[PDB]
Scaffold this active site. Sequence first.
Site, PDB file in Angstrom:
ATOM      1  N   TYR A  72       0.782  -1.234   0.000  1.00 37.11           N
ATOM      2  CA  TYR A  72       0.000   0.000   0.000  1.00 37.11           C
ATOM      3  C   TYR A  72       0.814   1.284   0.000  1.00 37.11           C
ATOM      4  CZ  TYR A  72      -3.715  -3.317   1.340  1.00 37.11           C
ATOM      5  OH  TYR A  72      -4.632  -4.339   1.381  1.00 37.11           O
ATOM      6  N   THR A 129      -5.920 -14.061   0.335  1.00 36.26           N
ATOM      7  CA  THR A 129      -6.925 -14.368  -0.675  1.00 36.26           C
ATOM      8  C   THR A 129      -6.673 -13.830  -2.084  1.00 36.26           C
ATOM      9  OG1 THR A 129      -8.167 -12.399  -0.042  1.00 36.26           O
ATOM     10  CG2 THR A 129      -8.735 -14.454   1.064  1.00 36.26           C
ATOM     11  N   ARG A 245     -13.476 -13.127  10.090  1.00 29.96           N
ATOM     12  CA  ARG A 245     -13.153 -11.720  10.020  1.00 29.96           C
ATOM     13  C   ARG A 245     -14.491 -11.037   9.837  1.00 29.96           C
ATOM     14  NH1 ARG A 245     -10.365 -11.143   4.029  1.00 29.96           N
ATOM     15  NH2 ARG A 245     -12.293 -11.146   2.785  1.00 29.96           N
ATOM     16  N   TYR A 429      -0.223  -4.148   5.693  1.00 33.60           N
ATOM     17  CA  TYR A 429      -1.329  -3.201   5.496  1.00 33.60           C
ATOM     18  C   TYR A 429      -0.741  -1.871   5.975  1.00 33.60           C
ATOM     19  CZ  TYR A 429      -4.558  -7.277   5.439  1.00 33.60           C
ATOM     20  OH  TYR A 429      -5.228  -8.446   5.144  1.00 33.60           O
TER      21      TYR A 429
END
EC number: 1.1.3.-
Length: 475
Positions: A72, A129, A245, A429
Amino acid sequence: NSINACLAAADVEFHEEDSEGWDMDGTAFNLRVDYDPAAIAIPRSTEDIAAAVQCGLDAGVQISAKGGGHSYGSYGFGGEDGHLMLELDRMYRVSVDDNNVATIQGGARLGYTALELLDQGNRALSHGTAPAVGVGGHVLGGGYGFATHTHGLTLDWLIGATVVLADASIVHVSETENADLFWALRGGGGGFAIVSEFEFNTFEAPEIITTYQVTTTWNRKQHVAGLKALQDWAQNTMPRELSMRLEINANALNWEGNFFGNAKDLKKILQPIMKKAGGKSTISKLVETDWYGQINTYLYGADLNITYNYDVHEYFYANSLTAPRLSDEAIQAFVDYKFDNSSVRPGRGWWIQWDFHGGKNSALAAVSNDETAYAHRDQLWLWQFYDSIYDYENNTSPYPESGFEFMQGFVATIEDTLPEDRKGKYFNYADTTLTKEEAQKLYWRGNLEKLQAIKAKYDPEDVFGNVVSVEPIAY
Ligand SMILES: *Cc1cc2c(cc1C)nc1c(=O)[nH]c(=O)nc-1n2C[C@H](O)[C@H](O)[C@H](O)COP(=O)(O)OP(=O)(O)OC[C@H]1O[C@@H](n2cnc3c(N)ncnc32)[C@H](O)[C@@H]1O
Ligand SMILES: *[C@@H]1O[C@H](CO)[C@@H](O[C@@H]2O[C@H](CO)[C@@H](O[C@@H]3O[C@H](CO)[C@@H](O)[C@H](O)[C@H]3NC(C)=O)[C@H](O)[C@H]2NC(C)=O)[C@H](O)[C@H]1NC(C)=O
Ligand SMILES: *[C@@H]1O[C@H](CO)[C@@H](O)[C@H](O)[C@H]1NC(C)=O
Ligand SMILES: [Zn+2]
């Protein structure tokens, strides 16, 4: 180009700045933080990587390895302009031996890798994922997904690697060879070495996986009471075989995950907690499938098999947080923020993922903060905060000037209530607003000192550093 000349002399492919190749690999996934590399090398072998590193050294520039380019903060570029970029996505070979050990080149992506592991012995690995995410950045920072509560982080399966050091030397790392560097690679993030090949243990693809979704219809009060209940359950009850989650946005809160077992047993596990959470919820998805099936349940429109033809982009600001059990005040603050402080202009949107990271039965939490560089083994919770600009081609406001305060405030609702030592963030993240000093403390907490010492040993000149990476500081 001085660097390009050096690369050509070493027979290493590179992109000319005014080329289509450059426009593709030189454009960051996150357009909000797109940078201009000093040059882009495209190694095809370990020797190529070493030759490229030597070129960067001769040029006097920092060198950044780019795996899948999904960070990111665009750390594959070094998180800023001017670094020699090593685009590794042409190096994605996956080879499983007779001992079920998978050797994965440093530029491989999750989707391709999962497909290869299944094709070569029906094997599997624990990872995220998204098919486009690079195995490299993923494992170096952790590697979290629906298999983590049951099988740990991607880095918990790493047993070795062939890497190129800051001085262009090539060495093998493992628990018995250059073990200090091996420790750092497992959670230390970027800047320690450039990995040409990762060596992973693997597990047999499970016979059955049941995917599920629980949809809630909770008001403000029910959000607080529900999260409080979910917290106690996550801490003491949630089974090793289950992952979960919470998908949170302005108008919803849903639970989702995978269960290493059948739907009959899963319903019996969810029933009690759905009741304890205050009801007002229902199972909206429940399907028994296999490994390939669960992978294909969370692609979100992405192509599963991705290698070097990648030109997908977004414009956003993300953030994260790790934390221990929360007080009622913290949960109340978080919920109030969702209900009263999350209004955004049309063309902008947000979502949060509340991950059941640690807990009594979490395989991740079964590993000590000392066993790998990963420093959040003691944290029950992991969160991903995402602020997206959908119509960025027409309007980016409030960015790049502002907009950060929205998610920074969302994080604060919880973070402000935590003891300083328990405040953390997850490097995979990344929060780009952080200074290098703040980032090191949040991303690596208790393991920072050891990591800085290891960094000083293997890269004293900080040739591989990025804007928030572990600094080289001898013990
Ligand atoms: C974009 C994205 C990211 C993401 C995700 C879904 C999408 C669409 N889902 C995730 C998930 O389910 N779980 C998780 O833990 N992370 C998820 N991510 C987050 C993050 O992007 C990834 O975890 C990962 O960090 C990205 O890796 P990638 O390899 O794609 O990144 P990069 O920008 O090119 O580089 C990242 C950093 O590590 C270094 N790196 C990468 N490869 C190497 C090798 N081979 N050797 C040495 N260092 C490497 C970079 O230098 C940088 O520091
Ligand atoms: C995911 O996409 C990949 C391409 O991006 C596919 O990779 C291709 O796999 C082929 C084999 O499955 C390779 O073919 C081999 O090519 C070499 C020389 O190129 C030949 O000597 C071999 O004989 C040939 N294999 C055979 C049929 O014997 C391709 O080279 C390879 N392409 C690239 C660029 O990597 C994956 O197959 C695909 N995954 C799947 C199977 O869905
Ligand atoms: C959130 O919104 C309220 C009004 O609903 C405002 O008073 C507050 O300053 C905003 N930010 C904070 C501190 O949560
Ligand atoms: Zn330029």
